[PDB]
Amino acid sequence: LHFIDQHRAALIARVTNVEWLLDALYGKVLTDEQYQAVRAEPTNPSKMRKLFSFTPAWNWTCKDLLLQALRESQSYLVEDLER
Amino acid sequence: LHFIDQHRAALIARVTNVEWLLDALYGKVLTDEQYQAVRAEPTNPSKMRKLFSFTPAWNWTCKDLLLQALRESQSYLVEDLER
Amino acid sequence: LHFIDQHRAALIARVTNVEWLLDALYGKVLTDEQYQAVRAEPTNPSKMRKLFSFTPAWNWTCKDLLLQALRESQSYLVEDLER
Amino acid sequence: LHFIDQHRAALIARVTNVEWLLDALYGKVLTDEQYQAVRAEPTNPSKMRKLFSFTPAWNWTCKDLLLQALRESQSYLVEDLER
Amino acid sequence: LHFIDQHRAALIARVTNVEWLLDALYGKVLTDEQYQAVRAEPTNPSKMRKLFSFTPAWNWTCKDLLLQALRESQSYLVEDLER
Amino acid sequence: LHFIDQHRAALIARVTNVEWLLDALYGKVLTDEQYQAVRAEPTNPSKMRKLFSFTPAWNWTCKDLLLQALRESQSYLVEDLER
Amino acid sequence: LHFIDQHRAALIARVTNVEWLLDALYGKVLTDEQYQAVRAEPTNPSKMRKLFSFTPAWNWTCKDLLLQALRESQSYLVEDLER
Amino acid sequence: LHFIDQHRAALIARVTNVEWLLDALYGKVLTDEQYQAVRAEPTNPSKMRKLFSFTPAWNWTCKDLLLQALRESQSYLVEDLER
Amino acid sequence: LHFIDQHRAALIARVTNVEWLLDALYGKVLTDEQYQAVRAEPTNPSKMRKLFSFTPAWNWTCKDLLLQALRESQSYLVEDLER
Amino acid sequence: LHFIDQHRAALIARVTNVEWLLDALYGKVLTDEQYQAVRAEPTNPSKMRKLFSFTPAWNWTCKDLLLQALRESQSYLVEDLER
Amino acid sequence: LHFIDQHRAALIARVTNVEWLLDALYGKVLTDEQYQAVRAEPTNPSKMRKLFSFTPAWNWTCKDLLLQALRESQSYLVEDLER
Amino acid sequence: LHFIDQHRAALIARVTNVEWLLDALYGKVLTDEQYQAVRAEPTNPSKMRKLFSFTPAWNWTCKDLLLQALRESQSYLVEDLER
């Protein structure tokens, strides 16, 4: 939701488990070509920037899916960002 | 805590019992995929650098857990670094 | 079949015997270069993701072969996923 | 069952009779290749970590089989861990 | 010959005496470096897969030599595979 | 036959004189190197496990020979295992 | 109890009646395979080290049994170690 | 010579021992940086393609050196390709 | 200092322990993203070129830190370059 | 102390009684897993190299303990090395 | 000296006692991390190539040290290479 | 000489008295560490394979010494291998 837009820079600079999020979002929110494009980036911040480049076409539901995946993967990161 | 960030290079170059720390952090701070990824590195400094690559997503509590595991495993190393 | 696409994330994160599947699929579905490319990945999830990267070129028969190999190797995993 | 996941680190660090467990789990939970791979590790903790690397594919029944084998082999260890 | 390519998976999963084959193939089909590389694998299936990784460069004569070595070492395995 | 695969664990844990069986199987099923490798194990269960490590390459006839040797050596063990 | 952990090196280097202790601990603390494995060591210190290799799985009751068996076996050694 | 250009695809897909060729060509045809770049590829076809990427800057003598190295390493492959 | 700018090509082509320098410069001169970007290069010259791409933003103090790290790591290389 | 670092190669090549040192260093300087890892090496130089691989984490006190154990075990070796 | 550069391929393919050279060069030409990295290679040629990967940073004195270590370890190999 | 390379497999599979050859080659051709490494193998073929692992570093004189020792030890084996 609005969470990923409010903490965009922190999420880009601090998310470390990107492949899990990609697998969670595959098919439902991400097409195969976008999946490969994100996966082809060198570093984790680059991968997160490429993934965020697709966010303008997302509605509230897709952002909620991403937030749920983040909560399942890195609960501590989400708790820290909320605090 | 801030201890692991203060002594990052020394911890990378001097920690010798990495599997014990991985077992301590498994399931709570490290996912199974990250566990295998760290375990697949050739040398101890490589394993420590791969483990530290996941640090930016950690909060204070995860770093406290890592420091407690280090104290339990290598008390002498922690005492030397503090001194 | 559609089974490997319905449970893509679970199969990626839970398949542990990858070399047996690679041997089962060698020649018939996988070329030698793709075989080495999959075999060169560090961890099991990495190998599974690399193998799934070749899926878009597969028809129903290739996916059926993969599912049959999975049933022969890990019957319990397939039974759990179906349930 | 969930017992082996709850006491993963203790089981890795404390199980001493691994060959008996491997023989108990051979064929029905462990393939021959996995049996050889576990048997090729140098030390008991290494063998236990290699064996636990196959657990993500296991369902509840396989973990029950492992727990039953542990109870038959080292009852005292199981009672100590439960207490 | 084509026999080792037709029964590749079975040969990998069932050949148990690899050292004799390596000694038979040393010098004339296998270089010293390849010999050492095959020797370094943990398990018999791993050794056989490493050995098979060199097969793309082999001609018919090398495969005939390997088949002759297999017949000399494990005649029963070859007879079972043909049947 | 299938008997030695059905009672693998019991045969490993209960066979007493492996040297007689090794003499019976020498040359016909076991090469000299395999004979020496089995003979070099410390304990009887270790010897039986090493011997069973060669069984994947065996056909029905070799297992029948082993069962006949067992019947000649320990009739009582075979009768106990049947019931 | 904690006694065998406090005087581990002294017990390893000074215990001379090992077969009696093995008989005392047989069945209830030691399996048959472990019994045979300990009996296969060349020297008394090696046997005692092999026996101590199984202590990580033991609880307080098993160590108490070992200490009691030592007390009947070599009372002078125990009272010298306590002093 | 023209041999490597005529059989480029087969050489890429069938050459299995690349490190020997790299050592043979080091210093005379390959710089240290090119050597490291070729050595960093995951699979044998990738290494061969990376090595062939340097071909356009070679004259007849360098290609002759590569062919001589191939004859010394894989005589059977060269005879098969010529036939 | 001006030393690294005077010997840029030699340092790029001859520095072999880059990870130690990266650890020395982490946090103080290099950000986490720059650290990952440098670490993602295939070969040592590529890593050195990527690291040198950040030097236009450095003052005298950062270059002094890099030179001190080089002296600590490769004293012989610095002495050779100065000579 | 610095003695074991000044005479590292000589200590690796000349120490013959490693079991006594391992028993002396058990628990207080060496964890159980490290003890088993050192005990699994084939030869005495291999055991000493494995033991020395743990030295980067040691402080002055641990090295002093090792030197005291060496003096108690091999007085002649220490006297020769000092001279 | 220039000897190791002139006979690079032969030294890579023929040096058999690498651990002795590593111990000789430890602490003077090789850091601990490089020592571990070289020690982690599977085969002797792999270890030699990994060691030679650090050559570009060496000056004449380091190569002289390596040549002296080779003369002390394999006098016959050096004599054969010289002629 | 070339004799041990022409009959490598036969010598590996047929030499039965290895200690005498090791004692003959001690110091002059074999270092103490290599002597211990060869002596630690389980079976005679394994010991001979470990011994032949050091052959590539040998010149003609070392092979002549080994052949002379073989003639002193097993004259009948050499005479049989000649014909």
Q: List CB contacts of K56: < 8 A, sequence separation 6 or more.
A: H32, I13, I14, I16
- Contact criterion met (CB < 8 Å) for C13 and A19: no
Neighbours of K9 (CB within 10 A): 17
Could you tell me how far CA K76 lies from the centroid of its own chain? 15
- Contact criterion met (CB < 8 Å) for D13 and J33: yes
H/E segment holding residue I47: helix I44-52
C65, C6 contact by CB (below 8 A): no
Amino acid letter, residue K10: A
User: E-chain residues within 8 Å CB-CB of H17?
Assistant: 31, 33-34, 54, 57
DSSP string of chain D, one letter each residue: -HHHHHTHHHHHHH---HHHHHHHHBTTTB-HHHHHHHHT-SSHHHHHHHHHTTGGG--HHHHHHHHHHHHHH-HHHHHHHH-
F49 touches chain E (CB under 8 A): no
DSSP state of E40: T
Residue with tokens 């002498």: B76
For the purposes of burial, counting CB atoms within 10 Å of the CB of F32, is it exposed (0-12), middle (13-18) or buried (19 or more)? Answer: middle
Neighbours of K41 (CB within 10 A): 17
| Phi, psi (rounded to 5 degrees) for D40 | -85, 0
Q: CB pairs below 8 Å between E and K: how many?
A: 13
DSSP string of E20-36, one letter each residue: HHHHHHBTTTB-HHHHH
Tell me the structure's resolution in angstroms, rounded to a single decimal. Answer: 2.7
For the CA atoms of K78, K82, L3, L9, the dihedral, rounded to the nearest 10 degrees, stands at 50
| Phi, psi (rounded to 5 degrees) for H58 | -95, 150
Q: What is the 3-state secondary structure (H, E, C) of chain C?
A: CHHHHHCHHHHHHHCCCHHHHHHHHECCCECHHHHHHHHCCCCHHHHHHHHHCCHHHCCHHHHHHHHHHHHHHCHHHHHHHHC
The structure's method of determination equals cryo-EM
B11, B78 contact by CB (below 8 A): no
Long-range pairs of F29-34 with CB within 8 A, sequence gap ≥ 24 = F29/E76, F29/F58, F29/F62, F29/F65, F29/F66, F30/F54, F31/E17, F31/E20, F31/E73, F32/L13, F33/E17, F33/E19, F33/E20, F33/L13, F33/L43, F33/L45, F34/E17
Residue with tokens 């290389």: I77
- Contact criterion met (CB < 8 Å) for H36 and I45: yes
User: B-chain residues within 8 Å CB-CB of A74?
Assistant: 57
- Determine the Cα–Cα distance for residues E70 and E61; give it in Å rounded to an integer: 14
Task: Return the SS3 of K53.
Answer: coil
Structure tokens at H46: 């990738």
Closest CA to I27 of L10, B12, B16, G70: B12
- Determine the Cα–Cα distance for residues I27 and I35; give it in Å rounded to an integer: 9
Q: List CB contacts of I15: < 8 A, sequence separation 6 or more.
A: I21, I44, I48, I70, I74, I77, K57
E66, E48 contact by CB (below 8 A): no
Structure tokens at D21: 């467990």
Structure tokens at C25: 């699929």
E53, D47 contact by CB (below 8 A): no
Structure tokens at B43: 């040398």
Instruction: List chain F gaps (C–N > 2.5 A) by preceding residue.
Output: none
Instruction: For B45, name the nearest residue in chain K, comparing CA atoms only.
Output: K33
Residue length of chain G: 83
Q: List CB contacts of L51: < 8 A, sequence separation 6 or more.
A: L18, L21, L22, L38
Alpha carbons within 13 A on the beta-carbon side of I16: 24
Provide the total of helices (H) and of strands (E) in chain F, helices listed first: 7, 0
Instruction: For D37, name the nearest residue in chain E, comparing CA atoms only.
Output: E43
| Phi, psi (rounded to 5 degrees) for L40 | -90, 0
For helices K44-52 and K32-39, what crossing angle results, to 10°? 150
Closest CA to D5 of D55, D44, D61: D55
DSSP state of A49: H
Closest residue to H26, CB basis, from K8, K13, K45: K8
Closest CA to E21 of E69, E74, E77, E76: E69
- Determine the Cα–Cα distance for residues F22 and F35; give it in Å rounded to an integer: 7
Amino acid letter, residue I21: L
Amino acid letter, residue I25: L
- Determine the Cα–Cα distance for residues L3 and K67; give it in Å rounded to an integer: 30
L14 touches chain E (CB under 8 A): no
- Determine the Cα–Cα distance for residues C43 and C21; give it in Å rounded to an integer: 15
Instruction: For F55, name the nearest residue in chain E, comparing CA atoms only.
Output: E16
Structure tokens at D58: 């296991």
Q: CB pairs below 8 Å between F and L: how many?
A: 12
Residue with tokens 């022969």: C72
Distances, alpha carbon F34 to alpha carbons E81, F22, L18, in Å: 22, 10, 18
Closest CA to G55 of G17, G2, G14: G2
Distances, alpha carbon B48 to alpha carbons B38, B43, B55, F51, in Å: 8, 9, 11, 41
Does an interface of 3+ CB pairs under 8 Å exist between F and J?
no
CA angle centred on D19, ends D13 and D24, rounded to 5°: 110
Structure tokens at J28: 């207080």
- Determine the Cα–Cα distance for residues F25 and F19; give it in Å rounded to an integer: 10
- Determine the Cα–Cα distance for residues E79 and B38; give it in Å rounded to an integer: 45
Q: List CB contacts of H6: < 8 A, sequence separation 6 or more.
A: none
Q: List CB contacts of K47: < 8 A, sequence separation 6 or more.
A: K18, K38, K39, K41
User: B-chain residues within 8 Å CB-CB of J53?
Assistant: 16
Task: Return the SS3 of L75.
Answer: helix
Q: List CB contacts of K7: < 8 A, sequence separation 6 or more.
A: K81
User: K-chain residues within 8 Å CB-CB of J9?
Assistant: 23-24, 26
DSSP string of B36-51, one letter each residue: HHHHT-SSHHHHHHHH
User: J-chain residues within 8 Å CB-CB of L36?
Assistant: 42-45
Residue length of chain B: 83
Instruction: For K34, name the nearest residue in chain B, comparing CA atoms only.
Output: B43
Amino acid letter, residue I63: K
Domains defined along chain E, listed by start: 2-82 (1.10.533.10)
D29, D62 contact by CB (below 8 A): yes
F44 touches chain G (CB under 8 A): yes
Structure tokens at F54: 């060669």
Instruction: For B19, name the nearest residue in chain J, comparing CA atoms only.
Output: J33
Distance from CA of C43 to the nearest CA of D (A): 11
